[PDB]
């Protein structure tokens, strides 16, 4: 796929996430990571992954709480560099 | 969890966080340590800060609980960095759910030592100090409280990256029992 897909936590700590992606079939320049409560409790927050990964570590997390993840993907490959279709999920921790 | 071999890359990423969190544990116990030395050298001559009694009462089991949890953490650490499959893990949470007395004889005692604490930093002059900058006090107190609870979360998302065939599975599921009966018992 052109994009990123198939967004899951595969793995958790009371306060911490492992999310995993299919990567895509570009050479991905720059992954942003998103996430906040889904609630608006706390701001949402970003960080950097290298483009050269298809997974990323959530930590300083709320336990027992709603969030929304979302992931951004910037290619030179991609007509305006970030991917047409950002990929959430949302997960209680 | 199915494909054993995903299994033991989730298993290593929880233990990393434990190693993590453990840090961060360690350096919020050294945080209430610190301040022990002068208030304890202070106790002893005729200007105290706080009576012998009052640092007992307030930092009681700190100490021990920083060496269980260093003890749990230097243990852990060598084996997170020589990851396999044959790499076992058990026995280290094994030998801290047997030091859970530790843990009973702090949460018995917290609610004394929260007092004992607030009273002096909203009256005494150099410990409400002392408890403005550790690198607050009674949130530090705390943390053992909150922590303990949450063990039988994280022995339980540890189990789920744990089969069982590998012998690692009997002790932590029997650590997660012992935890669980603590946390009862409280």
């Given at each position: 796929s052109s994009v990123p897909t198939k967004?899951?936590?595969?793995a958790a700590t009371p306060t911490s996430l492992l999310i995993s992606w299919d990567a895509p079939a570009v050479t991905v320049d720059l992954y942003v990571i998103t996430y906040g409560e889904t609630g608006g409790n706390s701001p949402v927050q970003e960080f950097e992954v290298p483009g050269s990964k298809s997974t990323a570590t959530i930590s300083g997390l709320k336990p027992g709480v709603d969030y929304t993840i979302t992931v951004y993907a910037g290619s030179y490959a991609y007509e305006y560099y970030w991917g047409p279709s950002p990929i959430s999920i949302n997960y209680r921790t | 969890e199915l494909d054993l071999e995903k299994g033991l890359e989730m298993r290593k990423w929880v233990l990393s966080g434990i190693l993590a969190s453990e840090e961060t544990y360690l350096s919020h116990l050294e945080a209430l340590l610190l301040p022990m030395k002068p208030l304890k050298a202070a106790a002893?001559?005729?200007?105290?800060?706080?009576t012998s009694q009052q640092i007992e009462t307030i930092f009681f089991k700190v100490p021990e609980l920083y060496e269980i949890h260093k003890e749990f953490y230097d243990g852990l650490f060598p084996r997170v960095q020589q990851w396999?499959?044959?790499?076992?893990?058990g026995d280290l949470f094994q030998k801290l759910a047997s030091q859970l007395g530790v843990y009973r004889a702090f949460v018995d005692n917290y609610g004394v030592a929260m007092e004992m604490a607030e009273k002096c930093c909203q009256a005494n002059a150099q410990f409400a100090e002392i408890s403005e900058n550790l690198r607050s006090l009674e949130t530090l107190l705390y943390k053992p409280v909150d922590r303990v609870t949450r063990s039988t979360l994280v022995l339980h998302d540890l189990l789920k990256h744990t089969?069982?065939?590998?012998?690692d599975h009997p002790l932590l599921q029997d650590a997660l029992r012992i935890s669980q009966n603590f946390l009862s018992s409280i």
């Open positions: 967004l899951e936590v595969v | 002893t001559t005729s200007q105290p800060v706080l396999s499959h044959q790499q076992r893990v089969p069982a065939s590998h012998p």
